From a paper:
CB-5083 is a potent inhibitor of p97 function, with an IC50 of ∼10 nM. In order to assess the effect of CB-5083 binding in the context of full-length protein, we carried out cryo-EM studies of p97WT bound to CB-5083 in the presence of either ADP or ATPγS. The cryo-EM structure of the ADP- CB-5083- p97WT complex resolved at an overall resolution 2.5 Å allows unambiguous positioning of CB-5083 in the D2 domain. The inhibitor is held in place by a combination of polar interactions mediated through its terminal amide side chain and central quinazoline scaffold, and nonpolar interactions involving the pendant phenyl group. Importantly, the N-domain is in the “down” position when either ADP or ATPγS occupies the D1 nucleotide-binding site. CB-5083, as an ATP-competitive inhibitor, can exert its effects on p97 function by blocking the allosteric conformational changes required for transition from conformation I to conformation II.
Critical functions for p97 include the translocation and restructuring of proteins from large cellular structures such as organelle membranes and extraction of ubiquitinated client proteins to facilitate their degradation through the ubiquitin-proteasome system. Here, we present cryo-EM structural analyses of four disease mutants p97R155H, p97R191Q, p97A232E, p97D592N, as well as p97E470D, implicated in resistance to the drug CB-5083, a potent p97 inhibitor.
Residue numbers in the entry:
A (entry chain E): 21 to 707, 728 to 775
B (entry chain F): 260 to 707, 728 to 775
The structure:
């Protein structure tokens, strides 16, 4: 079967011309890490690149870049043959010129100022009839060769000369512009984008197989998340890189036109897409199409909603059309649109984490050069409530300040702006310091679903809790098989209790990292808001988005907030049962045990917690979080001081030994007071940048202890209320 | 298709899709074109989208179309054979004027298939795709309970794409026409189905599950006192209808039993349903307390409606005292023990027919706060007490918990059940769970044995709780021979 062709996929490397393979790949073709490789394809064209060795990408797979996928005219799901080509090449004369589509506003020489600097120390090959793309110079421009030395023998070298004629040649329809959006342009959405690959690549890349088998492909995908998360360029990229006819309808334009032709327009949208098979239809605004919850107004609204329902219901085999849609909330859509055959597959995307946000900055700043002291990693750390469009706007906004701080002194007012100054436009760090000050982000109060960064290693002590948490949620995650072998269902959730300020939230975060699971935190105010507001559909989406992000962990902070607000143990004439806890009970009863979703309840007063939530099957597992011991207190001190200059003589072991009945909050305020004293001494001494032993010794005087002994006694009475290890302590079997 | 009748399908959204004025004409001419194709059959797919006459009250054309349908179905004389079937989600989501005589008199309610019902629905959708010798569809239809018939139809295809994707990467056969000599080798694997139940999010999860249980009286040991009265209280009117008309005694409408928590009240009700071969409907506490807080009290209407159409059925109310606990209990507020939800249940139970085989079972752990009116004769006059499991019944609880675990020969469950006396079913359950946890932990740590050993149970026996106190047993008994009263007339002699 000629075992030489392999499938093509996307490369995670950010390099321009780098091809990554697996370990048993170059050992068969006896090629080194800097040899010459020749690749072929359709249209009777060849290619040449540089093979790079990598053993971390995958097990047996070849990577392949975007700048050459369009150059060789290759699309996904195709076969590619690779063979070594040890041919000595040497370029002598070159002649490249850009296309008159991206050179607007550029004058003067442009060959000895951009092309010469980037060619050196690269030795990149080039074949005849190729459109390479280069990023930099505050723009995205390309060049095309029309006449040079006979192919091949093309090697870049500083000794090579170049020349120009002065007449750009327009591009044709055979090639595709690389300025559009592809898979490499998506940053942060890794797990969510991975799903669309296994749902839209089968029907669009292999049509004859679907008109051969009886499998019904999905007829609709609903994307989610707040505006700006990137629901549109995802749909445009999965169309641009799949060769499917992308047809965009926004959703407000349907209501923009007169009543009577709006239905006809999105009707004919479906037939014009069908004849362009394979096709892909994306509806940008859908909550503005079917808000069938409180509107109940407008004869044409229902007519358009039903017209869409009919157009998507009659999606038989016929041709390959995929109808994706975007909206903000799951409940803001007509439930009749969620039926089978209209929207069966739903993918929810959200705010990218720090790692997800880091990869979204450089994609938007690849054109603007940075300085040696400008790092994008630290700027994606203090921001947590920024949507993907927020940072896209922030990059440009910093760019105007960067150019404004120099145009005042340059004072070059003319009709046409010379292209010899963009090379000197380097952004500074102060350009970004102002960027996070006046920028007001949109998505700030939402469910942050991110994997934490706190592990068990950075938590000292608490071996008693470490051992039971690891055997209660980690075992069903890392060893599913040993549970079916023993016929034991995993526990649904655990509620732990303890004095305030002892790290219950951090413990839940740490157990999420051990299982490599997502983490969702619901604090007290979010739980008590729906109690006062009499709006109790909010737990529905909480439990919905907790289960779609499998595997996840659900954490409820200060669960006793409603009981405290109602009175507690007695309060009013009623008991300890309310409506919000009832909704949580209903949602937990209906969950599937085979899923890896896990609910963790945190409380400081477990005596006022409703007994029904602790019933077996919901939160039967109760563990007690005590005060940190000597080993765990050092961890709290060093976590607080990990960002501060600590002197060598400042011994944290002794400080943690001295404080015994101290909570995490008590150590936190000790560290904060020491830092305040150090800052004040540094400020007053100006008229030293190191925290000294005296700072901690003096701040140790105002040492509080917020947790009293009576509290520890009342928590214990609760603890071996449920321990009861009496009676059957000594048992001997007969034989 | 199998009756040779002209099938004409109208969805229901297409009526609202077209302009106002011809939509009425289209579903009008739909009826005459069906009549001349006699015999005919008309099915309306979306009907809740046609007549949502409960909260809409908006749109002149909506009422016009609803009335046009009412006129088209009212004028259904003999003439020709046309049958107008329709589909909708809820009974209350339909215009009540459509339920009149001559429009929709016959109603059939279908629901989620059970494990047996789901098993026969898999192979019909996978008859074309060949399976392996280790792929069994029975075990995959067991852990799923909230899957609609379309859910598994989608799941089969979804597993098919994974099955072909795991091999197309290595086959690497890219061409225009795909050869037919490879489908014969497309065999689905069990791992194709393991991933299928992970990312698939089912739709119907929070609904009334109406299925026949699988727990019988044989697997329940002991409880002969309750076995004898339950068998003579609901089984007799089901298996011997004639002996009741012969003796002129009406069957009891329902029985409420009480007992300490975690003793198997739900399992007892399930077992008595299998003995009578009757359907079982369970209503837990949260579903009862949701409508109390929500002030939405039409929910008991459909509960009692779907409990009576599935004749014969058994209706089970779990923790009936939930509303009383939420309101305070014996005293609580200035009010008594009467509320709105229990009032609706009383109204629905008073209006039921005794000749039907529907049966209501109430379960509670605090019968002192139960409203007295629900225990009035004719509604729940029969009260039976569920005690702690005895030695014979505790072995059943242990073996039910351990029926899926590797039990060693030396592990004697009879002795373990003998040792624990005042232990509830929950206490034995946590003992078994703790022993399984210890065995799993030892197996995991020993890797760096696949059998539960005697030591696992012996060590886990140390943390043996007893959640039910003696004061609780005393307070339940005070309630029990509160209503026993076998004094006074204990010795009677007739004259002759
Ligand atoms: C700033 C900080 C404040 C704080 C508090 C508090 N009431 O201020 C309570 C518990 C932990 C706390 N931390 C804290 N924060 C961190 C860590 C850490 N050490 C491990 C730990 C966790 C729970 C328990 C013990 C010790 N402690 C470890 O690395 C991540 C951040
Ligand atoms: C897992 C299980 C837990 C449990 C509990 C509990 N609070 O954990 C209470 C009562 C019965 C329980 N079962 C249980 N489950 C089953 C059976 C069975 N034995 C019969 C029985 C029923 C009620 C009573 C006695 C004994 N017991 C029998 O086969 C079906 C499943
Ligand atoms: N997750 C993301 N990855 C890459 N770019 C993004 C992302 N989210 C937003 N952007 C950028 O923000 C800009 C605005 O996106 P926008 O059209 O608001 O997305 P949507 O239509 O989904 O709200 C786009 O040009 C896009 O490049």
């Amino acid at each position: 079967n000629r075992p030489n062709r392999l499938i093509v996929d996307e490369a995670i490397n950010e390099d321009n011309s780098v091809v990554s393979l697996s370990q048993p790949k170059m050992d068969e073709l006896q090629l080194f890490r800097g040899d010459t490789v020749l690749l072929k394809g359709k249209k009777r064209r060849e290619a040449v690149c540089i093979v790079l060795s990598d053993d971390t990408c995958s097990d047996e797979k070849i990577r392949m870049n975007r700048v050459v996928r369009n150059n060789l005219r290759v699309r996904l799901g195709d076969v590619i043959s690779i063979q070594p080509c040890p041919d000595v090449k040497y370029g002598k004369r070159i002649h490249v010129l850009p296309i008159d589509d991206t050179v607007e506003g550029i004058t003067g020489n442009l060959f000895e100022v951009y092309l010469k600097p980037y060619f050196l120390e690269a030795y990149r090959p080039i074949r005849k009839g190729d459109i390479f793309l280069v990023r930099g110079g505050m723009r995205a421009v390309e060049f095309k060769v029309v006449e040079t030395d006979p192919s091949p023998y093309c090697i870049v070298a500083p000794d090579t000369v170049i020349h120009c004629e002065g007449e750009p040649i327009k591009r044709e329809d055979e090639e595709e512009s690389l300025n559009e959006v592809g898979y490499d342009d998506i940053g942060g959405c890794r797990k969510q984008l991975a799903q669309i690959k296994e749902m839209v690549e089968l029907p669009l890349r292999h049509p004859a197989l679907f008109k051969a088998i009886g499998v019904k492909p999905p007829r609709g995908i609903l994307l989610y998340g707040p505006p700006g998360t990137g629901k549109t360029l995802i749909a445009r990229a999965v169309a641009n890189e799949t060769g499917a006819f992308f047809f965009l309808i926004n959703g407000p334009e349907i209501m923009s036109k007169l009543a009577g032709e709006s239905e006809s327009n999105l009707r004919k949208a479906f037939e014009e897409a069908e004849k362009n098979a394979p096709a892909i239809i994306f509806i940008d605004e859908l909550d503005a199409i079917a808000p069938k919850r409180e509107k109940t107004h407008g004869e044409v609204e229902r007519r358009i909603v039903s017209q869409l329902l009919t157009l998507m219901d009659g999606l038989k085999q016929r041709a390959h059309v995929i109808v994706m849609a975007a909206t903000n909330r799951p409940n803001s859509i007509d439930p009749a649109l969620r039926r089978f055959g209209r929207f069966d597959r739903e993918v929810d995307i959200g705010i990218p984490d720090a790692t997800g946000r880091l990869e979204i900055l450089q994609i938007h700043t690849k054109n603007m050069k940075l300085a040696d002291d400008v790092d994008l990693e630290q700027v994606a750390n203090e921001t947590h409530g920024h949507v993907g469009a927020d940072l896209a706007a922030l990059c440009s906004e910093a760019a105007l300040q960067a150019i404004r701080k120099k145009m005042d002194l340059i004072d070059l007012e003319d009709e046409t702006i010379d292209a010899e100054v963009m090379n000197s436009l380097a952004v500074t760090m102060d350009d970004f310091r102002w960027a996070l000050s006046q920028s007001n982000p949109s998505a700030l109060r939402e469910t942050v679903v991110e994997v934490p960064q706190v592990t068990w290693e950075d938590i000292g002590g608490l071996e008693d809790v470490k051992r039971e948490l690891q055997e209660l949620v980690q075992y069903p995650v890392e060893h599913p098989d040993k549970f079916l072998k023993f016929g034991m269902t995993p526990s649904k959730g655990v509620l732990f209790y303890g004095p305030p300020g002892c790290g219950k939230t951090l413990l839940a975060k740490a157990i999420a990292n051990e299982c490599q699971a997502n983490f969702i935190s619901i604090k007290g105010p979010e739980l008590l808001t729906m109690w006062f507001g009499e709006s109790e559909a909010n737990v529905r989406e909480i439990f919905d988005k907790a289960r779609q992000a499998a595997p996840c962990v659900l954490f409820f902070d200060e669960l006793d907030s409603i009981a405290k607000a109602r009175g507690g143990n007695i309060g009013d004439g009623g008991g300890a049962a309310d409506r919000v806890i009832n909704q949580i009970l209903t949602e937990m009863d209906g969950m599937s045990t085979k899923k890896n979703v896990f609910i963790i309840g945190a409380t400081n007063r477990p005596d006022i917690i409703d007994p029904a939530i602790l019933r077996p099957g919901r939160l039967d597992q109760l563990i007690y979080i005590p005060l940190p011991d000597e080993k765990s207190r050092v961890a709290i001190l060093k976590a607080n001081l990990r960002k501060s200059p600590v002197a060598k003589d400042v011994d944290l072991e002794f400080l943690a030994k001295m404080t015994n009945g101290f909570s995490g909050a008590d150590l936190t305020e000790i560290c904060q007071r020491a830092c305040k004293l150090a800052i004040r001494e540094s400020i007053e001494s100006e008229i030293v940048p190191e925290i000294r032993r005296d700072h901690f010794e003096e701040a140790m005087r105002f040492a509080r202890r917020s947790v009293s002994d009576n509290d520890i006694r009342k928590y214990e009475m609760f603890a071996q209320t449920l321990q009861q290890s009496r009676g059957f302590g000594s048992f001997r079997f007969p034989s």
